[PDB]
Design a protein around this ligand. Sequence first.
Ligand SMILES: *Cc1c(COP(=O)(O)O)cnc(C)c1O
Lengths: 807, 157, 157
Amino acid sequence: LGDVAEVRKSFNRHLHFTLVKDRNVATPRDYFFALAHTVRDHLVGRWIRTQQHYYERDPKRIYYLSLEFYMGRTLQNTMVNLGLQNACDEAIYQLGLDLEELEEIEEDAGLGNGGLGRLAACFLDSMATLGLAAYGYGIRYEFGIFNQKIVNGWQVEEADDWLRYGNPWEKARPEYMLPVHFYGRVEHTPDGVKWLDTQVVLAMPYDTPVPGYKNNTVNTMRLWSAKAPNDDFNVGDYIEAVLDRNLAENISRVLYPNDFEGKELRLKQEYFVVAATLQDIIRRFKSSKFGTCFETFPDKVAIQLNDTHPALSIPELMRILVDVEKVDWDKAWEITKKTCAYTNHTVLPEALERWPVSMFEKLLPRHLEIIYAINQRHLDHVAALFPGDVDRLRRMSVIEEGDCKRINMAHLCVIGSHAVNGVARIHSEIVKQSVFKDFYELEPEKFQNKTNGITPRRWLLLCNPGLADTIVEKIGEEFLTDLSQLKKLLPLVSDEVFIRDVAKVKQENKLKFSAFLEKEYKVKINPSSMFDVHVKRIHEYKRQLLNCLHVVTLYNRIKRDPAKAFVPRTVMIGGKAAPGYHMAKLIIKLVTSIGDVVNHDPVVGDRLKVIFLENYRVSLAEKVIPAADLSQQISTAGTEASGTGNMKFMLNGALTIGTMDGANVEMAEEAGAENLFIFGLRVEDVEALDRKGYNAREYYDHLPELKQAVDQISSGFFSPKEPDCFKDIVNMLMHHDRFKVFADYEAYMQCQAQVDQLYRNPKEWTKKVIRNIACSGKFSSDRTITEYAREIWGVEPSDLQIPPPNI
Amino acid sequence: NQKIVNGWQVEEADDWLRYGNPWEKARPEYMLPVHFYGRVEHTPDGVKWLDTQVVLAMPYDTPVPGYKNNTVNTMRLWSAKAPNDDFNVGDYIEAVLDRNLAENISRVLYPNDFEGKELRLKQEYFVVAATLQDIIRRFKSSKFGTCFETFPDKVAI
Amino acid sequence: NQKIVNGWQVEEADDWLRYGNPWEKARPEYMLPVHFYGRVEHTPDGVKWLDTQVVLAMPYDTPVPGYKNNTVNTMRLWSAKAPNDDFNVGDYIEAVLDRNLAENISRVLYPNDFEGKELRLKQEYFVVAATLQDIIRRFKSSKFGTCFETFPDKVAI
Ligand SMILES: *Cc1c(COP(=O)(O)O)cnc(C)c1O
């Protein structure tokens, strides 16, 4: 190949001219950078051409606004979307280096946190693959959230210094910087409303390429860094300036800060992305090749609000249009509603974001005025349609009364958007009928569903090339951009060759992940054991404790009859606890405490191993998901909207043990519920238990295997040196357990036995797996994005065709 | 001071010393130092606590009268004050803040502030150190005063 | 930058790095610590300088080309940066100020600020300590390296 020679020549060129190093002084990190630059150069040609193409053809632009972008690592994705993986592997080998070693030096982008952020990243990959003129907008968080470390079995938060050595992917655009205004006061003058005496924070943009899979599109993620404007002063004025500089820069410091007016910092962050972004969208709109003029704005601009975090987009668009662009209020409002769309990710109305009005009086006095005007006009309309309905007016109002007046940002999003969607079929029904019941009665057509999805490139082609090839051999390459083509795998459940091939891939993946496990955690991993994986946020509603009780029950069962034939398990539990969440940190400690007992018991041996997977991130998900046999998706029914981890396990050859909630429902409906290990209380059963009243004591008293497990946890069997360590866990499970852990224990145990009986038969296990994989095509973010594009954005995929670039 | 506004509790500041307290007598002459931070050094002449920040404990005495007897006892309450005074811009701000953090030791009861827990610990030590130095000073300043063997017979804490 | 406004000199800030310097290469990997303040302790294992504040010296290298020869030498210029990271309200403000006072070591040439004289001394030490640690590191990291006896033959300052 001439390709292998080009990468080799480009790597050395970057090493000498970009890094200003030679092979004697270079570190592995320098080698990662040299390669990352080599690979980025292949994107640049397409990136320039793509932006030249959108300027020429002026397509409708999609703006995806999120406070989270859980991007992971970029080197591998970039290499695969450009087809250069094989050429780089060989070039790096010939250079005396190891591609996978270099891949491990890259930092996980500290730009996301959980589901909401990964959803944004999958979306961006799909929008680029579908040829949409899409731009991701967010904050360039300098220190991510935190890297989880486990010290003495407890979680410790370490700072995520991911930009320490620089990010090779991003380009700084200091020339496209915009001012963000805070505080000040508002004056009504004859020339229009003026927002005066404001503090100014500068928004500095950094652009990152978002490549399309096997097309020529390379889109942009534009992330803003907070910087103070520089400069008279007395001693006090000098200290005021240094502090304002620091408070400016900590807007883009960490994701979801705590600090207790660190809530004011969250509001500042929200406005900082909104104002930065909207000024950029408008500037792009009026700077079009060949440009009263704002009437075409809803035809050239869609703004998607990923949760209520970017909710200020509504009154800020109203502000720029009316106070700067001199557009008439009514016209600006009809423009606002048509440009904005809102996606909700939560169930029950109390999770929805609220801000005190007093906080708005101080930080954003002009936006408060606009919000008040939007609300009044909205309630006049409601009063016209439903005369004398006084309680309807209070329910539908964006401003709520209580111990202080508050602004319901969700209500503001509903009123200022043309479309409102939930993230799964039943969640979207709850969004309609319960969360925004009154809004649904007034405008049913506004409310929609956009079932979540995952990208088939990262969550298959990247993390599981072995499985990807085995599917490619049988049904060709077209499924990678049209994942519903995996249904052609259905007849292959009879094929003895395919079954032994899918099983071989899984075991290869299991062996590669065992090697990571033994090296890092120092536990002897059984290769023939079943990989039982539960990876998500440590939270009571997610019920890692339910999984803990199962593990203790199994430990006790091996101890009672050590001669008995037992299905071997490697139980992996991972996830980050919120720093101030006392119960979740107790739970992490329980898992490691259980593991200490289980993994060091000589009677137990190679039958049961328990590991807490430290620092669950995007990059680690890509190692563990392809190696999983069983996926635990065991949240209490009625708590989960969707879930995307569910989808990742289904595509990578794992069977699912779960409740009938969130994504599991649509996964059952796609593959048939018999191919999934559904158990426990149904949404309606949970409600019926609340009518009876949950008495967890009755369960503990009349379930012997559970009583033994809880007593061990309580008495200090898993914590000999500090026997009251889990007192608050036990106290919660018996008296305050809102998530009904005991109520689902029996059903969960019985269900795990059915899992054990299926794993005992390798062929029928893998047959059920093939049925899962073949019916997962629906859960492609391509499908989700095509849905958003046609039913919300009014754009057609592949209507823009970027041609091969010029160097 | 609790206020009820629109049926809810509002916390208003208790400015009870605004106009002065007629009952109490300031004893600035019986002030004692309270030490914080620093480091500890084991020397041949005994253990030494060095490089400490110092907060001053200023005593105010209030009479506690006995019912139909002639006894009037003392309540001795300590106010936190920073010692006064070279400096660069940063050293000046450090001093102003330490002055404020000193004085907020005796600002409010059970403060919240989340290292306002550190402020509770400071408050606890401030009363302990102030008081114990005063108890000892009183003990050795007795009319006609190895010598500490009688301490448990002359002092109950 | 001198500006003449109404016939008088006005001092305008020289924002020369605003858009970046294309000539220089950042070497964050060759950063060295600079120590300030602290105290000194004579121990049996030698003199120790303890409880110091640390400012980081980040090197930036600029090429210095020879005329019609193949030599391109180095100008190595140090930027002051504070080390990053528990804290109460006062400790937080102390940290933000020390961060600012660290970074203003490499802000302007010949600053005025009147303990801006202390800032000049800090600047002087910052270049000295940064540089001498770099000179020594280069000396002992030579291809094939009591050992300091050749130092005056391999080093002129
Ligand atoms: C896909 C993914 C998630 C989402 O998991 P859910 O529990 O399904 O919300 C979270 N974290 C990481 C690292 C992921 O890759």
